[PDB]
Amino acid sequence: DLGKKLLEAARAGQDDEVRILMANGADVNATDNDGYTPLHLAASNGHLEIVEVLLKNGADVNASSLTGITPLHLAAATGHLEIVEVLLKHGADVNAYDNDGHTPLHLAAKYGHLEIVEVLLKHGADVNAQDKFGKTAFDISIDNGNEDLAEILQKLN
């Protein structure tokens, strides 16, 4: 029962509850119906302190949802830079791909997060990786009208 409560506490930003639930033995890598862990939910909701607490307590930094989405995918897509950095520091795969072939770089490009693109690039993000549509992060930046971002990526073509 503790797993569902940890998932909710992480999503909701309740850090003291997250801590107490762990102490009670909650599975840090419990998953919801979509295969998201507390770390996924904390990352997508921008809860940095909770991200740090989960990692200190053995969260799977490379956990994949039912569709292959990782916490780094979610932090990159939602523009949480500090969380992206922490996840990378703890060993998140910068070039993980979901079931549609999207990498964190693809998602940062899609949602127009220039600073996150810069960070992923300085940690070995693959500018040549193509999704299932044959598209690179540059192609995605163009499809989504993110011109300022496309500039940077174009020079790496």
Quote the CA–CA distance of 118 and 57 in Å, as a whole number: 29
Q: Which of 12, 24, 23, 19 is nearest to 1 (CA)?
A: 24
Number of domains in the chain: 1
CB 14 within 8 A of CB 37: no
> Residue length, the chain?
157
State the residue range of the domain holding 10: 1-157
Which amino acid is it at 143? Answer: D
Quote the CA–CA distance of 125 and 94 in Å, as a whole number: 6
CATH number at residue 52: 1.25.40.20
Helices (H), 111-157: 114-121, 137-143, 147-154
Which amino acid is it at 39? Answer: L
Resolution number, Å: 1.7
Angle between helices 81-89 and 114-121 (to 10 degrees): 20
